[PDB]
Design a protein around this ligand. Structure first.
Ligand code: ZN
Ligand code: ZN
Length: 99
């Protein structure tokens, strides 16, 4: 008869299952908002914007419009150059005798 292995790849160009068939959640390394360039590209969490246009609209002065998500929370500075100990065990209220 002629037994041979056959190949059958699936184009899957337009699938009708899974609403987000895309498996990308980071973004390409090319800024598509202001223009194509790699001089100062910065990768947002789920979005890509370069510093050149990022400064004009700020990274997130109020909200990132491309991420389509609000961020009212803030990130702590994670720094503490000053942190002396305190306790004030000695009670204070009356004036000093001052001999
Ligand atoms: Zn840009
Ligand atoms: Zn963003």
């Amino acid at each position: 008869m002629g037994n041979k292995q056959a190949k059958a790849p699936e184009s899957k160009d337009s699938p009708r299952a899974s609403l987000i068939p895309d498996a990308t959640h980071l973004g390409p390394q090319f800024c598509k908002s202001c223009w194509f360039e790699n001089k100062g590209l910065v990768e947002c969490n789920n979005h890509y914007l370069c510093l050149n246009c990022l400064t004009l609209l700020l990274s997130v002065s109020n909200r990132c419009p491309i991420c389509k998500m609000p961020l009212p929370t803030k990130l702590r500075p994670s720094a503490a150059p000053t942190a002396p100990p305190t306790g004030a065990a000695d009670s204070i209220r009356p004036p000093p005798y001052s001999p």
